[PDB]
Structures are given as structure tokens and as C-alpha cells.
């Protein structure tokens, strides 16, 4: 009898899924590649290592630029957070972590704060205003902390291996809004420019758009054949790109509620650790497990370049707000600023 009611609910779910698939197909009159055909390709633009940041003793699992397009932070499993001056390569701060296992780091837009987290299942907030000491420790995630991003100094959104994201009130130190409905580990998150929305990558091979204020999933994006390790918003906030273990990058549109484009190349089989757009959004940068970082044309779906500075897989990427510099980080313990 319980099965009979479950059979109904299954059949209804199937019907609804078919409707969405059919509604999305009705939406496609044309494709992104078709409409951009007259657009002159980027070509091949060669970049170079303009800076090499040394002093990390282990794998670098994450990094985040400052909003001033100068300072940046990095998280290594050596048990250290390091704030760098990218111009002079001077180490501004070295922050000892109570847990040497750290999978992410973030830099507050005000520049007053920095966050990090990992297998300790905690997002730790460090105050940068002599030396640096921790301000807040936000607990309650039962899974590992994969990613975190500041809305402002009082608000941060985190994602975890317990399949949930969260909105935190840092002042109270309490979780404000909990985001549920992912069936797998959430590897990454990205806020919309206006911080009205944010998207999440996960091990369920799906990306999900969440409402920050009302605390709900709006849309769900699929088509990836493996885990989504990275996610990033297109500058206008109407689109986002996803990196994955299926070796592919996928551009999704919010209004169209579907996949616009796949960025992948035969002979590229390795997983993708990180993604970032350029300032205009024309260029999509992706960190790979093959030690490289490939530069894709977002509109033309062609590779505009390649970056190999690293002897180990590239774990993370970043692009300055001014779009002047590209930062890579890796398991080879080194950071490289490209221009």
C-alpha cells in the first residue's frame, strides 16, 4: 500500500520531468554557436608568467583575489593561509590554521576579513585588522566545507559535503538559511553579482540556482556526466559556467533554463578543478588535472590558449576585478600570476 502511493509519486515525477525536457526543447530556436558565427574569433593569445609566488610547503587547494585587484589569499594543506601582494610578491600575512586540512578560502570584499575551511567541517573567519587572529568559527556542517563566499562582512554562504549549502549570519554566528535538495556532495558555489541568487556545483552532476532571500531552489541544471567541481557566474548574472570531472565545461543560461554550450576537446579526458570568466565574459578559464589551464572562447566554443606553469594539477583559478591578471594555484605548492 505504501508502494502503491510511491508508484504514483514516481509516475508524477516522471511526467513533470518530461514536461521540463519538452519545454526546454520548445525554447531552442537556435544555439549560441549559430548566432555567434559572424563573431571574429579571439585567435591564439599568448600569455606569460609575470609572477611566481613561493613559500607554500604543500598542495594549494584554493585561492581568492582581493577586490583591489592586488592582494590575494591562498589555502594550502601545509596548515597555512597566506595573503600575497601580487605586485611585489611580498608575503603580507601567514595565518596558522587549527586544522591543517583546508579545502577552501575566501577574501571579504571589504578586505577586512578572510575565511577558510575543510575536513574540520567549519568555516573560520579571520580578522585582518599587528598580527592576525580568528574572529568567528561557524559550525554545524556535518560534511566537509568545500567552498565559501562573503556577501559582505556580516554574511557568508558556504557549501558542504553533507549535500547542503548555507547562508550564515556571522555576527550571531548562526545559520540563517539552509539550502537542501542536492543528492550529492556540493563541491562549489558562486554568487550572482547582485547577491540575489547563487549557483552550486555538486557530485549529483547537477547545478542548482538558489534564491538567497526566500531560501529556495529556483532551477536545476543537468547534462554533466560526472561531478561538478567548479561553478562561475557570467558577468551580467544571466548565465553561469561549470567545470567537471567529465573533462567538459558547460555554459548554462538562466532565462532559457538550459545548457547553451559545451567546452571540451577530444584528447582532454582529465577532470576540471576550477573555472573563471574574464571581465567581459568572453574568455572562460579552466584549471585541469593535466597540470594545465585552458583558455576557452565563451561565444565561439574554441580554445583561445593554454597555460602550463605547473608540475602538478592546477587546483584553483582567479581573475582580478580589473581583469588585468590571472592567478593559478596547484598541488606543486606554487602560485603563478599570468598576463
Amino acid at each position: 500500500s505504501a508502494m502503491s502511493e510511491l508508484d504514483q509519486l514516481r509516475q508524477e515525477a516522471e511526467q513533470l520531468k518530461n514536461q521540463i525536457r519538452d519545454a526546454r526543447k520548445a525554447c531552442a530556436d537556435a544555439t549560441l554557436s549559430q548566432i555567434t558565427n559572424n563573431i571574429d574569433p579571439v585567435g591564439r593569445i599568448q600569455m606569460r608568467t609575470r609572477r611566481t609566488l613561493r613559500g607554500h610547503l604543500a598542495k594549494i587547494y584554493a585561492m581568492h583575489w582581493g577586490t583591489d585587484s592586488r592582494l590575494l589569499v591562498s589555502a594550502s594543506q601545509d596548515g597555512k593561509l597566506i595573503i600575497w601582494d601580487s605586485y611585489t610578491t611580498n608575503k603580507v600575512h601567514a595565518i596558522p590554521l587549527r586544522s591543517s586540512w583546508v579545502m577552501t578560502c575566501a577574501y571579504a570584499p571589504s578586505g577586512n576579513y578572510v575565511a577558510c575551511g575543510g575536513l574540520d567541517n567549519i568555516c573560520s573567519i579571520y580578522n585582518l585588522k599587528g598580527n592576525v587572529r580568528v574572529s568567528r568559527e561557524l559550525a554545524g556542517h556535518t560534511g566537509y566545507l568545500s567552498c565559501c563566499r562573503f556577501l559582505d562582512d556580516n554574511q557568508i554562504v558556504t557549501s558542504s559535503g553533507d549535500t547542503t549549502c548555507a547562508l550564515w549570519d556571522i555576527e550571531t554566528g548562526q545559520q540563517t538559511t539552509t539550502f537542501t535538495g542536492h543528492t550529492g556532495d556540493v563541491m562549489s558555489l558562486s554568487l550572482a553579482p547582485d547577491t540575489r541568487l547563487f549557483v552550486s556545483g555538486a557530485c549529483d552532476a547537477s547545478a542548482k540556482l538558489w534564491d538567497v532571500r526566500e531560501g529556495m531552489c529556483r532551477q536545476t541544471f543537468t547534462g554533466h556526466e560526472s561531478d561538478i567541481n567548479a561553478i562561475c557566474f557570467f558577468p551580467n548574472g544571466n548565465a553561469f559556467a561549470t567545470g567537471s570531472d567529465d573533462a567538459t565545461c558547460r555554459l548554462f543560461d538562466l532565462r532559457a533554463d538550459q545548457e547553451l554550450m559545451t567546452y571540451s576537446h577530444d584528447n582532454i579526458i582529465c577532470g576540471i578543478t576550477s573555472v573563471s570568466f574574464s571581465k567581459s565574459g568572453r574568455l572562460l578559464l579552466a584549471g585541469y588535472d593535466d597540470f594545465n589551464c585552458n583558455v576557452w572562447d565563451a561565444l565561439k566554443a574554441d580554445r583561445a590558449g593554454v597555460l602550463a606553469g605547473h608540475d602538478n594539477r592546477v587546483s584553483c583559478l582567479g581573475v582580478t576585478d580589473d581583469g588585468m591578471a590571472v592567478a593559478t594555484g596547484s598541488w606543486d605548492s606554487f602560485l603563478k600570476i599570468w598576463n
Partner: protein, 337 residues
């Protein structure tokens, strides 16, 4: 290019400090505790502190006094709850009053408080023949292995001046989601032991973070064999861990734990519960070895990797001390060059 040199000087100060931390970090042996919940991982970490460090002094034990009370209460409560499911009546009908008063007094504090009133209630319940009959059926529901340990010692624990012994502290049960790290020195060697604790996720994503750690201590509870299958569930996990590509150069150490329970339990519950194809006699020695074979056969690397197996009781400071001495030797022998 003058006044900004002061910043460069601070960078070099930082740069040297990283070098200093890095030198000392390289001489530290990194151990990784794995295995299912309640396998004894938290117990062993405590033993490392007990054996190779100062251990637990009076003040350290006093911190655990609250947890001792909590574990005791949570134990007797679990039995009472099971009495309903198994249709087991109280020996004395008046014990239903204590059972209610228990749940009421269990509500008085979110921490473990212990007063004469609560002690009398738990004691009278524990002595009751109905509760004892439900206890003997504990293989049919979730219950602490330290349950009878605390409840039989209740008269001592209920004391006003009571302080926890080191055995009391070892027996306590606590669940932490966050990874637990500890440091100690043995034979001039520095150790970092890592317990993932309760990490709720798909292990595939965080497993590579531990690539290159010296050895893995995988804890398995022998007594889980007759419980609903927890043993077969452990084998699946170990099958994944031992044969993992990330652990190739990592020494795989296998602890078969709670051997004290298993030896007594095998007198009643047959191994055929867990392994129906088992045609052997039910004896502590044969059955324990059989289980060992089941876990070791899971190795697909047999020509390359070796599984170092031990039969351990983790509450026994002496037995752990002896076995860890063998663990130390394996690390030295297996990795040196």
C-alpha cells in the same frame, strides 16, 4: 623604493618562519585512522595520549565526569525504549514509574547531572529482571558496549566525590563530525594521528587529501558480526580503502577490535549469522582468524601490497602498547631509504 622596503623585511620574517615550521613538519609521521563508527578510533587516540604522553591526570579526568553521566543515562534509556519494541514487560510493574521519572529527570539538564534521586531510579531499573531480559537481547537493537560497564559500576559513579578513572575515560562515547588531530612522541619519532571522525559525505572526493601519509590504521569491530550487516558493510569500506590508488605507498594496518567482546559473544551467537557458508567450529581462535582471512582476501594487490593484521582490545592499555610497538616497527621497516 625606500619606505616600502619595511614591508619587504616583514615578508622575509614570515618567509623564515614558514621554513622553520616546514623543517619540523617533515620529521613527523602521519597516521590515518579509518573504519566505521563505534570501531574504537576515539578509544585508540586516547590510548596514544595515555601511553606515549602524560596520559589523563585528575583534572583531565574531571572534565569527562559529565560525559560519564551522559553515557550512563543514554544507555539505560535505550534499553527501556527497546522493551516496547520487543514487547518485554517489567519484572515489577512499579518500575514503569521509575521509567517515566527517568525520562523526566533526563530532561532536567542538557548536560549530565547526577543526583541521588536519578541514581536510585537508574539503579532500580537496572536491577529489574525485565530490563535485564531486554539487555540480553541487545543484539536486536542499538546499544553501547560500555553500557553494562557503567551500569554495573553505577554505585561508584553515583558518588558525590566521584572522579573518573582512566578506564572510565577510555570507555566513554562521543561523536564529533570534525576531523580530530593529535600529536605525540614515541622512540624519538613525532606522530600526527588523524581521525576523520564522523565525516558524512562520499569519501571519493576527500580521499586524495591523504595521499602520501605514512600508514593507515583501519579499525574493525569483531562483535558487529551478529548485528544488523555491519561486518559486511565494513568489508566493503576496507575493500575500497586498501586497494585505493592514492594509498599505494601507504602501509595498510588492520586492527580487528573488540576481541574481548567477540570471544564471549561467539559462545552464544554463531558466526554463520554473518558468514552462512562457514563450516568451521565456533571458537574464538578459528572464527577470529576466519574474519581476518575475509578482510585480507579483499586485497587485489597481493603481489605488491601487504596487509598487517592485528587482534586488538583497545580499552586495554597494555595490549595497545604492545601492538603499537609492532606498528612502529612496521613503519620503520617498510618505509626507510
Amino acid at each position: 623604493s625606500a619606505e616600502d622596503k619595511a614591508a619587504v623585511e616583514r615578508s622575509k620574517m614570515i618567509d623564515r618562519n614558514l621554513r622553520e615550521d616546514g623543517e619540523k613538519a617533515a620529521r613527523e609521521v602521519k597516521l590515518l585512522l579509518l573504519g566505521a563508527g563505534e570501531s574504537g578510533k576515539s578509544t585508540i587516540v586516547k590510548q596514544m595520549k595515555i601511553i606515549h604522553e602524560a596520559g589523563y591526570s585528575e583534572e583531565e579526568c574531571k572534565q569527562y565526569k559529565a560525559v560519564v553521566y551522559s553515557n550512563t543515562i543514554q544507555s539505560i534509556i535505550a534499553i527501556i525504549r527497546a522493551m516496547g519494541r520487543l514487547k518485554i514487560d517489567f519484572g515489577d510493574a512499579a518500575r514503569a514509574d521509575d521509567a517515566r521519572q527517568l525520562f523526566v529527570l533526563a530532561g532536567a539538564a542538557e548536560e549530565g547531572f547526577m543526583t541521588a534521586e536519578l541514581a536510585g531510579v537508574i539503579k532500580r531499573l537496572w536491577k529489574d529482571s525485565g530490563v535485564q531480559a531486554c539487555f540480553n537481547r541487545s543484539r536486536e537493537y542499538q546499544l553501547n558496549d560500555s553500557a553494562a560497564y557503567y551500569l554495573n559500576d553505577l554505585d561508584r559513579i553515583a558518588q558525590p566525590n566521584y572522579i573518573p578513572t582512566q578506564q572510565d575515560v577510555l570507555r566513554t562515547r562521543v561523536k564529533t563530525t570534525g576531523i580530530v588531530e593529535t600529536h605525540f612522541t614515541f622512540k624519538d619519532l613525532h606522530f600526527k594521528m588523524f581521525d576523520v571522525g564522523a565525516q558524512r559525505s562520499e569519501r571519493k572526493k576527500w580521499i586524495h587529501c591523504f595521499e602520501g601519509v605514512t600508514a593507515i590504521i583501519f579499525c574493525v569491530a569483531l562483535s558487529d558480526y551478529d548485528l544488523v550487516n555491519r561486518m559486511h558493510e565494513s568489508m566493503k569500506l576496507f575493500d575500497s580503502i586498501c586497494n585505493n590508488k592514492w594509498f599505494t605507498d601507504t602501509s595498510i594496518i588492520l586492527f580487528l577490535n573488540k576481541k574481548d567482546l567477540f570471544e564471549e559473544k561467539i559462545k552464544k551467537s554463531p558466526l554463520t549469522i554473518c558468514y552462512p557458508e562457514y563450516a568451521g567450529s565456533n571458537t574464538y581462535e578459528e572464527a577470529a582468524a576466519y574474519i581476518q582471512c575475509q578482510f585480507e582476501d579483499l586485497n587485489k594487490r597481493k603481489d605488491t601490497k601487504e596487509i598487517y593484521t592485528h587482534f586488538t582490545c583497545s580499552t586495554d592499555t597494555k595490549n595497545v602498547q604492545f601492538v603499537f610497538d609492532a606498528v612502529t616497527d612496521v613503519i620503520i621497516k617498510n618505509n626507510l631509504k
